[PDB]
Design a protein around this ligand. Sequence first.
Ligand code: NI
Length: 205
Amino acid sequence: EEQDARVPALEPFRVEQAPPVIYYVPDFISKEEEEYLLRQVFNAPKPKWTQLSGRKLQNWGGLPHPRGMVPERLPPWLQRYVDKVSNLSLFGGLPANHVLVNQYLPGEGIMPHEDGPLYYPTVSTISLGSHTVLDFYEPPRPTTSLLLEPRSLLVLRGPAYTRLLHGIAAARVDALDACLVRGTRVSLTIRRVPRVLRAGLLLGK
Ligand code: NI
């Protein structure tokens, strides 16, 4: 599982003290690229947002579903980054086809979870706006935590996808020791959904 999950080109960005296999690439995007992404996410039609209890999100590329995803064309402003991460060969030899945008106001997070079998077992996430701390849990207290800085790419593969839980604490500040105040964070999670329906086909139920 671990040998299969290594990405030779990302070896210099391996987070060696974290569970196998996590990559963290600082400055994966420029400040101008980050600003344009934030502008496009915020200028999206109001109906693109789903309000949850603890955050709000957008699905781009379709709604993943165990009976098959009805696809939607990704816009070029997201396809550019889907291509960049798919060129790192992260999704088993086929390109990513889905982007989940999360917005976290200061104080918001996400309960510990695994991303599960609707996706090829790789998470790639580009962070925008503000830092956060990602907590990892054995399937309590976190086993490891990682600071995610704006404009970074995080990649979780192998057991870091299939065994470990990840979460973000509903916190306003992160003490590193020194102390970072959270702003609004927007994350772009780029994954490959293997079960996609042909164009025009609907399944009921
Ligand atoms: Ni997740």
